[PDB]
Amino acid sequence: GSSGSSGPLQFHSVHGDNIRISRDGTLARRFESFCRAITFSARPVRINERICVKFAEISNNWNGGIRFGFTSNDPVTLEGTLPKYACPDLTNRPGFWAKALHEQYCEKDNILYYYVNGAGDVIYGINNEEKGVILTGIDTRSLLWTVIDIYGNCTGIEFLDSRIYMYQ
Numbered sequence: 001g002s003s004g005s006s007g008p009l010q011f012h013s014v015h016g017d018n019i020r021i022s023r024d025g026t027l028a029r030r031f032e033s034f035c036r037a038i039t040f041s042a043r044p045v046r047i048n049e050r051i052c053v054k055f056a057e058i059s060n061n062w063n064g065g066i067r068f069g070f071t072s073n074d075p076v077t078l079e080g081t082l083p084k085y086a087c088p089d090l091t092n093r094p095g096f097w098a099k100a101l102h103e104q105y106c107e108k109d110n111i112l113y114y115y116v117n118g119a120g121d122v123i124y125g126i127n128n129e130e131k132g133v134i135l136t137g138i139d140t141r142s143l144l145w146t147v148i149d150i151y152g153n154c155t156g157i158e159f160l161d162s163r164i165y166m167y168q
Contacts, residue, residue, distance in 0.1 A: 008161045009051060010042040012145075014079035019150070027056055029156040034062065038086050039157075040075035041146035050162035051146060052113035057156025058106070064152035065106065068114065069098035070122065070138050071145050086149035097122070098147060099135040106153040113162065116140075128165070 001013065010026040017036035021028040028039055045051055067086045072095025083089035091098045105112070105126045114124030114134075122135035138144070150157060 008163075009045065009159050011159060012040045012042045012075040012079075014075045014082065015039050016082065016150075023158070027156060027158040028150070029057060030150060035084055035151065036082075037151040038082050038090065038147070038149045040071070040078065040148075042075075044143040044145055047116050047118060047140045047144075050113060050115040050166050052111055052160040052162045052165060053148070054158045054160050055106075055108050055110045055112060055154060055156075056158045057154070058108040059153060059155045062152055065100050065103070066152055066154045067098045067100055067147075067149040068112075068124075069096070069135055069147050070116070071096050071147050072139070072142075073145075075145050085151075086147070090147065090149075095139075096147075097135055097138055098149075103153065111160065111165075113160075113165070115162075 011021040011028045015021055016038045018031045018033040019037055020031040030037060086098055090096055110126055112126055116122040116138050118140055120136055120138040121133040122138055123130055123132055124134050125131050
């Protein structure tokens with residue numbers, strides 16, 4: 001709610017119990033606790049639509065890692081109604097995808113970007129360096145939304161505009 005600047009990609013109202021999403025422009029930071037820390041996309045991104053996320057804050061003490069994927073249902077139908085974790089709950093369900101990232105790419109000041117092709121293949125990359133198809137099974141018929149859980153080696157995350165970086 002509040003603010004504006006329609007166009008760019010930002011965080012959706014729906015967020016974990018202990019998730020404070022608010023910044024001068026757009027950023028998602030944790031409030032407290034450990035569990036309950038799921039987040040979705042503010043607007044429906046397209047297949048080729050590339051997404052970027054700069055790791056603002058990182059946690060180096062807890063155990064586990066983060067998760068990133070796509071979904072079918074709308075993020076508005078999940079607001080104030082999310083599970084305790086991002087899986088198997090947020091995954092086994094019909095039309096839900098999620099994957100984990102390596103520890104080598106779990107640092108601060110790192111730009112985590114990832115997209116999907118017409119072959120339902122999701123490819124990610126760090127520091128403008130793709131890694132390949134990490135997630136699959138993504139449909140390309142109807143709208144789609146992204147998903148990201150911050151619980152482990154990450155605290156704050158700021159979504160960037162791929163339009164500013166990418167060009168091709």
